[PDB]
Design a protein around this ligand. Structure first.
Ligand code: Y7L
Ligand code: Y7L
Ligand code: Y7L
Ligand code: Y7L
Ligand code: PLG
Ligand code: PLG
Ligand code: PLG
Ligand code: PLG
Lengths: 457, 456, 457, 456
């Protein structure tokens, strides 16, 4: 045994599983708004010897030795992080060790808040993320609602937009110490200035969780939250098209003749390590650095502009075929389809689209009373846009979706409960082959496009 | 732009850094007890298209679709985890989604405890990990001491063993609901039967954090904590020689009535949706690769080797002029006490690093100082994976001995620790004396094979 | 030394101090809405040998012996408590050991909630009490906001009434586990049914803190909160005209064929003792029992009806002299005077009225921006009504208040900051004697009325 | 209706109960160590018009007006409190508003600690009070263990003294920010100098809860905790012979710079507005009356008497056939161990109550049971205020001895504790044997003078 054998030679069971997933991504129309296809260059850093190096601590302030090189990697990642978002290194710092997006947010709360201090975020069914403090009416779901006290703000169910007025009203009563400006399922731009005013009034930290829109922010195609946020967290594997990791951007420098300084850096860094995490995943840090360099290129601005145009085209196409969209349209990478005016819930549509190799997620529309069967779908452009999809290609995506919706509508006719629906898609021969025909035409269409990453895994 | 360009072509600045780090691992003798050299097979899975897949939830209970393949990847990782530790799938389950070791432990506390519920672990300067509840006298350090109430248990300060009596005494006063039997810097073995007895009495959960010793347990080379522990957490790197990830093993099934075990649902819910978001499916897959390697006859011979190279390192260290904490290693690492040699554990680590031996300073029982601890932590697993054997490991000890002796000569001419390191780079007599060793250090280490890719 | 000497003989320094306070209560117009004059019968029980008896525990379940008699006293107090409020002993229980009102409320939270569970009450400047969870924008004030997480509900500043709509909206976001229906400075009746609906929706306990209105509730002159509340707490020294103590009323009995039982009794009793308190003050328990018996009499219903008529007469008189009142009037024992439309803040008016032996408290009106100088006063009828004040007498009280307001208006002319105002009342000879004349006419008028309690102390 | 009618005329049902309770205290021998007979002067202030005055706030810093008189009442109570304990008003302050002892302690924790901060006290079965943080193995009992994290310190189970060594050992592990030196059932004296040393080391607040021994401290008859404690809490009844209330004494003033003491503002804010509402000015006044009595030469002779009647009770108890915990009382109470006499402390308390001797069962070191503890707590202060002396106190011991012996005879004919008490009321042989003693018990006690009113 040498440890240098190939995965295909050493573990054919796993090696084929990798190939099965690669074929699945190659043949499908991937519309998960949070998914992307990472570049081979980044993946080469992700699966590297940097996995072997323990480097607990920070560059220049480590707890072991031998970190000479990974110090330069981590410092280079920090510089590329600030560069990609046009940040002055004298006003902004970045922590590049958060293992993912959820660890990034929990680090911020741990850094700035005491246990049971109060947090406000967009409610999860309203388009906010778990780590913005999600509690149900029965259970504390996210740990950000266990270790901290969270009250959500809601959408205006008339506009589909964030009710900044109701947020301002309830924030003066709840008195949060931090408010999260950031979403998982929101098609519109966020009024960060308005969020800033609310935070300045109730004396709260404004945290921007730009995970979904980070790539658009780096390409300067949408307004940047760094103009108004004290803290900015993001995922690196969404519109940033990198490995799965997280980042925490924080302000530095000046916040009666007294110079008020920012105190985020030391608290944030201490929260990530040693408070929350152990050894940094330097392979992930490096892979993120590779993608961050890609985010400064003119190529990436072209890419991000395409993501915008393909989501508007997807939205326009859906509107033209009789679909309503929450908030009426989109100004970013995703579309929130309201399927209630067509008679199919988002749960049925998600499964029937999945059987024809169209990958989306059910989504709650304003007014939904059921979570077993939400009334919408979330569709995202970033992944297929990385496969060099253009506006016409996304209009064909909408025409495949419309076929799936019709097949699902015909099955809800012939079925009762949700489980009868799902089993009917597999056991009824007529619809089983009708699905297989659409699946085949979906996969033939998607296979023709180029795919970032390795060829075979 | 296609996204299929090579790293060397598209990002030469990063590619050179990768090559520089690979050269650093190839040329050095890696003695950090928590480090290992991951196999090429796992690394190819770590850097795979599985990074691209969001698969929030668990197999059969995910929240969107498209998880057809990663469901079987996660299930295969689960099966390989239970197989690797000889666990009956009806008595034990495993969560394979923890991002690392620290998240694995924090999920367990979240799953089983309420905020501010009480936990007991070995103190960090006594050899315990941060995530076992470490707070100092000045500051709450680990979040496991912020969100939960922690009191440490200590070593017998001249036996070098865990003071199991003092732990039993304080457990009835503190009344913890969970005690962690697991270490980061402990050369001997843990009495899991005794830990369970203490835990069974004060009615606390026994969790074993076998991160450092997980590989030795899987090879059935050391006693397994799964015989007495309710929950077991581990890292997938270290002695398991895998990607950076974490695992949570929990008991399952039946505990005048039938009381069932209720760990599974709580543990899984704590990992997702409570603490983490989307699983790192590439890490899960790479872990599955390494777990399969842990079932091999090869891995038992590998793990058996690590013990004897640590015992050989200990024996060799006892000679020359070193005493070692606990008097005798029984695992993969050695706790060497450098106080009976006039050199602190901090400066010895720095002098060894400039000569390409990477270790970590460690606090020995009685250390009156943390700026300058009195020991070093040395680990066998990394070099053993480079096919080092006992004769190869006795040479590192005297390669270290040249480093400890060379370091003593400069503390002669300097006072504080800043002056110490400063003289190592500016005095032409020692910079050459460092380089002279530095070549024979790298010349010796380069000759051994290295797991992973050749160039990155 | 025998321990049987008189206070006048053993401690003349204290004995005269007692007499000075008795003269002060006899000569003044006591308008503190929370104050009353306790009967001699109750005071005789208050200062009795029951002080000597430790009786930790409860009747029939004590931890020592010798409680044979105090068991009957405590049981008799419980029966008189239920009797006075027309409560079926099979549906209601009462704990009579809370040392005061604040201990009563903290016992309820401790009994029913975990630390950091959420609480909702009327904001303190809006008329709620500290123990309803009062936090400022800078500091946790009440311990009910330290050990539990509180969000306040506010008044509708247009009506002066509780904004039950905004309470319903914010309760669905905050998700409290207990809501407090009870006030310290509120002139109107509380919609307990509406509070009940809000609690039933968000699945919270409804606690009624009837402290100020308890006597009116016992006399059945205003609607009873026991028809809608799960828990009822009260002070015994306000409109109940008893010794200073507290009570916790809780439901008992029945809350798919399963009989759902109430679980308040054991938790409430355990919270009071041993969780929060030590030995019960049996002298206070007995004195409360004496006053509770008085609350069942036709005399007390006459008294409580008079308190209503004297507050309406006080309100009518103020309205006729150019004063506005928050919420426009009163349906209980107190009046909230808005002094902003007359140019005097409630802080100045309170001090100038105090120097002429009229005792009130400054009060915050809706829209007040300052707490140094609130814009109103809280005036209460219960105390003087116990001195056999009638409607005409309270119209004379208003005519004394109007003289004090005018004297204060003349001094704000001649002064600047608040401290200049207060010192001018003592150091300026012209106003000093002008005050002394009004004080004398106030005291001559009040001395003529009978006074409950002892003659000399 | 005027409100000036007498209690006997207006409420005869209650008036008879009052007379019945006064007769019960007059006819019985009160041996509860925490009970006393309050003076008429204080009771007349307790039941005064001061009940009618709301005076939220503090003298000079109240929130409404009309507090002209009660300001001087509270200030006089403050001055009398500091005077009674020989405190310099520049080094010590006092809050006189705590409703009782339990609120006094809870205010201190609220003032100085954050929720879930750590506290250490003597365990309740070891002689500590609820408010020192008592939680059992099943339930959090006191709110001082709910809102704050408590670990108890224990006695040396055969020395009967506080295990100051084990307390020093656990304090460095638990790292409390406050330790309570104070007891409800402890016959010896507390090493406040040693408690401060432990507190000074682990950097914790030393609070002394002198409730039981406050009167002995004021008479300078026992060593005063104010020499080493940062904060001192007490009840105003018990040995202080006052109304039911509580006090919080705190250090004030100055603690290369000048660090001032910061207790005053926090303590006062915790009492009001954090925890309590309006002060019970009648209780404050009655307390002031009793505090003035504590400055008398009479009170030192009274407190000196209580010691010798407890020492006489202990000496007499050592005879007959009783062993007592800690071997020797040095305060106002005796911890008698009834296990070396075949009778449990629970049944002895009941048999003594039917013969008009009121005591409380108490757990002795080694008690394998709480349903039936192995001791009784007996206190001198109550009967000493009735001008009992050593000869009078040696007769109570053998009045008790008839009770302990009579109780042994019925456990003969019964099994469980329910059958025990049931036989005391239904068997004509023992009900007469109880009544025969019961008259000589009441006949003996009635002859002594009684503080307070004659009829209520
Ligand atoms: N707007 C939004 N959209 C997207 C899409 C992906 N994510 C990322 C996270 C995906 C997970 C979403 C949930 C996990 C658990 C939930 C819950 O409420 N669970 C209850 C009741 C369930 C039952 O009774 O059916 C329980 O089981 O206890 S919802 C999000 C997101 O964060 N927000
Ligand atoms: N047996 C064991 N060994 C090893 C070796 C590495 N690690 C991984 C842990 C790496 C070290 C983490 C820290 C511990 C204490 C800290 C501290 O004292 N921090 C300052 C803060 C400000 C300052 O810089 O002065 C303070 O609170 O005073 S930091 C471990 C481990 O977990 N367990
Ligand atoms: N509506 C209403 N009215 C009445 C009348 C009597 N009470 C009973 C309780 C009376 C006490 C009222 C307050 C105590 C502390 C306050 C506060 O906000 N203190 C801050 C800022 C102060 C400053 O900066 O001037 C601080 O000092 O920290 S308000 C109440 C009542 O409960 N609610
Ligand atoms: N040295 C000292 N002596 C004396 C004598 C009276 N007290 C005053 C304290 C009076 C007793 C308070 C309690 C303690 C433990 C309880 C308990 O165990 N309760 C059950 C709950 C349900 C049940 O009824 O089974 C449980 O949790 O199991 S109750 C004290 C004192 O404070 N300290
Ligand atoms: C705004 C936001 N923040 C944080 C996270 C957490 O990232 P990790 O999953 O890497 O922990 C997500 C993931 N969102 C999942 C989705 O929208 O499908 C997110 O959308
Ligand atoms: C016993 C133990 N548990 C948990 C962790 C945390 O693992 P991550 O660093 O992957 O979070 C470590 C790391 N120990 C570091 C060392 O011994 O050098 C450990 O030693
Ligand atoms: C509604 C309410 N609840 C509880 C309390 C507390 O009672 P104690 O002060 O007895 O603790 C008060 C006192 N209110 C004071 C006032 O209105 O002037 C109150 O008004
Ligand atoms: C030391 C001590 N501290 C505080 C308290 C509480 O006091 P209140 O009961 O007034 O709250 C007690 C009561 N001890 C009861 C007994 O020894 O019998 C006590 O003994």
């Amino acid at each position: 045994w040498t440890g240098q054998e190939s995965l295909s030679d050493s573990d054919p069971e796993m090696w084929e599983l990798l190939q099965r997933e690669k074929d699945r991504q190659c043949r499908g129309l991937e519309l998960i708004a949070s998914e992307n296809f990472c570049s081979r260059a980044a993946l080469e850093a992700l699966g590297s010897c940097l996995n072997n190096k323990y480097s607990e601590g920070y560059p220049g302030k480590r707890y072991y030795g031998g970190a000479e090189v990974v110090d330069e990697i981590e410092l280079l990642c920090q510089r590329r992080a600030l560069e990609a978002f046009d940040l002055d290194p004298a006003q902004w710092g970045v922590n590049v060790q958060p293992y993912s997006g959820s660890p990034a947010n929990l680090a911020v709360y741990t850094a700035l808040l005491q246990p049971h201090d109060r947090i406000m975020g967009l409610d999860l069914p309203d388009g906010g993320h778990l780590t913005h403090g999600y509690m149900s009416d029965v259970k504390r779901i996210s740990a950000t609602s266990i270790f901290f006290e969270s009250m959500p703000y809601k959408l205006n169910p008339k506009t589909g937009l964030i009710d900044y007025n109701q947020l301002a009203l309830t924030a003066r009563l709840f008195r949060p110490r931090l408010i999260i400006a950031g979403t998982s399922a929101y098609a519109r731009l966020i009024d960060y200035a308005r969020m800033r005013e609310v935070c300045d009034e109730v004396k709260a930290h404004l945290l921007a969780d730009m995970a979904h829109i980070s790539g658009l922010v780096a390409a300067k195609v949408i307004p940047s939250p760094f103009k108004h946020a004290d803290i900015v967290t993001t995922t690196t594997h969404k519109t940033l098209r990198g490995a799965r990791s997280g980042l925490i951007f924080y302000r530095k420098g000046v916040k009666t003749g007294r110079e008020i300084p920012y105190t985020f850096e030391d608290r944030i860094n201490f929260a990530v390590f040693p408070s929350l995490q152990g050894g940094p995943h330097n392979h992930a840090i490096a892979a993120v650095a590779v993608a961050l360099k890609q985010a400064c290129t003119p190529m990436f601005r072209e890419y991000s502009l395409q993501v915008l145009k393909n989501a508007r085209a997807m939205a326009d196409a859906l509107l033209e075929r009789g679909y309503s969209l929450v908030s009426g349209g989109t100004d970013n990478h995703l579309v929130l389809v309201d399927l209630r005016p067509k008679g199919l819930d988002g749960a049925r549509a998600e499964r029937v689209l999945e059987l024809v190799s169209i990958t989306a997620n059910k989504n709650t529309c304003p007014g939904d009373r059921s979570a077993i069967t939400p009334g919408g779908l979330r569709l995202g452009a970033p992944a297929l846009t990385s496969r060099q999809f253009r506006e016409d290609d996304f209009r064909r995506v909408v025409d495949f979706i419309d076929e799936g919706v019709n097949i699902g509508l015909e099955v809800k006719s012939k079925t009762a409960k949700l489980q009868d629906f799902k089993s009917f898609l597999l056991k009824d021969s007529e619809t089983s082959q009708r699905l297989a025909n659409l699946r085949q035409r979906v996969e033939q269409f998607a296979r023709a496009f180029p795919m970032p990453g390795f060829d075979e895994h």
